[PDB]
Design a protein around this ligand. Structure first.
Ligand SMILES: N[C@@H](CC(=O)O)C(=O)O
Ligand SMILES: N[C@@H](CC(=O)O)C(=O)O
Lengths: 230, 235
């Protein structure tokens, strides 16, 4: 009963920021226009700049964006929002700010009550039960890895198993396999750049041109393509 | 500009060089720093995909020719007594979050740090190098378990980012390693982050922290361009 758009990344090569998301958002708005933007993943630019950038790219769709860090009453803003938009950046800072501000439960409840959730990269991580499949560096302690729990599977965004020539560090699959040792019940979706998962009208639909990989404990990786229904 | 460092540390970026055996490049470094020490306790908790028993036996085997006797801290009767009596503390690579979580849950963090401060030799590679720093905030590992805090041993005052490379797979739009480090420098502007490439190490001995290894090391500080360093540099 949730409406989610979970994107692996913001920008396709040679395209504008969020350009590929616009038609997906347009088809899922269903008349919604009022959005609150959660900017807390952003580190290297101000949350004001991040909000203004998001407002600009979505304006042609008729969406009005308000930055949650600028409103007097963030709980009321989330309550009245039709759309909750969570930007990419550092997933640990995103979760830490969201938890410290008491926004996790309100955001999840608002989405469960029919609001559209749009998140890319770190914003896709936050939709999962935990952030345990983020690729980000732990620059701040979020005081727990539990997240919004709007999507039941773990998403690993920006998925690629490639490494620089001669690198001896863990592959992405090796990192994921370690998670499957400690949490053997999990399903991990390796969502490559350019892909997304759209949850709408009772179906979780895989989208994007590249191959998606599913990892489960003790099972070989399974390749999926656009149109798969979870 | 570090002041006199009174600990004996060997902090390796990684375990295995291309075309070499596991820890082969570390053996001469360990041998030349032992200074007569023989008794080592191994901290295996970073290991996920193999048992800590297998990890310990592997470490014991590779170090036996150096005269080092290895016991795994997970199977001693009294881990606090084992650390107190150990001459060498060896912390293996693996997942840094699990390493820190087990070390904290078992109450070993302070005993390990205190024993090293009391003259024990500390050897760590990869996750074991992260653990020597004030925090694990520069690990490259996935947060598969919650360590209940990112504070670590605080034996080495600067942050090490091991396996350092700024390269990305063809066409990848994710963050570069330097971009991830620059974000840490926003939230923690006082930090120095050492981008320690594979094949390199930092050896703290006789009061000096000395860079080692054939590859270029990069130092990141807030608002400053990355600084290239080479073997022999004193931090
Ligand atoms: N840091 C990434 C998310 C991830 O890779 O976990 C982003 O938001 O772009
Ligand atoms: N996981 C790495 C450590 C790191 O890259 O942070 C290792 O132990 O080999």
């Amino acid at each position: 009963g949730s409406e989610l758009l979970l994107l692996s990344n913001s920008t396709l090569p040679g395209k504008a920021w969020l350009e590929h998301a616009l038609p997906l958002i347009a088809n899922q708005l269903n008349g919604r226009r009022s959005a609150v933007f959660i900017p807390f993943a952003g580190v290297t630019q101000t949350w004001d700049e991040y909000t203004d950038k998001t407002a600009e790219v979505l304006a042609p769709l008729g969406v009005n964006v308000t930055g949650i860090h600028r409103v007097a009453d963030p709980l009321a803003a989330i309550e009245k929002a039709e759309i909750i938009i969570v930007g990419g950046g550092n997933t640990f800072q995103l979760l830490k700010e969201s938890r410290e501000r008491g926004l996790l439960a309100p955001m999840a409840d608002r989405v469960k009550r029919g609001a559209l959730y749009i998140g890319w990269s770190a914003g896709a991580n936050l939709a999962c039960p935990t952030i345990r499949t983020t690729n980000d560096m732990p620059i701040v302690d979020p005081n727990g890895f539990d997240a919004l729990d709007l999507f039941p599977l773990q998403i690993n965004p920006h998925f690629t198993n490639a490494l620089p020539e001669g690198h001896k560090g863990e592959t992405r699959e090796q990192r994921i396999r370690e998670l499957l040792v400690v949490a053997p019940e999990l399903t991990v979706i390796g969502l490559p750049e350019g892909n997304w998962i759209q949850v709408s009208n009772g179906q979780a639909v895989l989208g994007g041109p590249n191959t998606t990989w599913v990892f489960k404990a003790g099972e070989e990786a399974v390749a999926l393509e656009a149109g798969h229904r979870f």
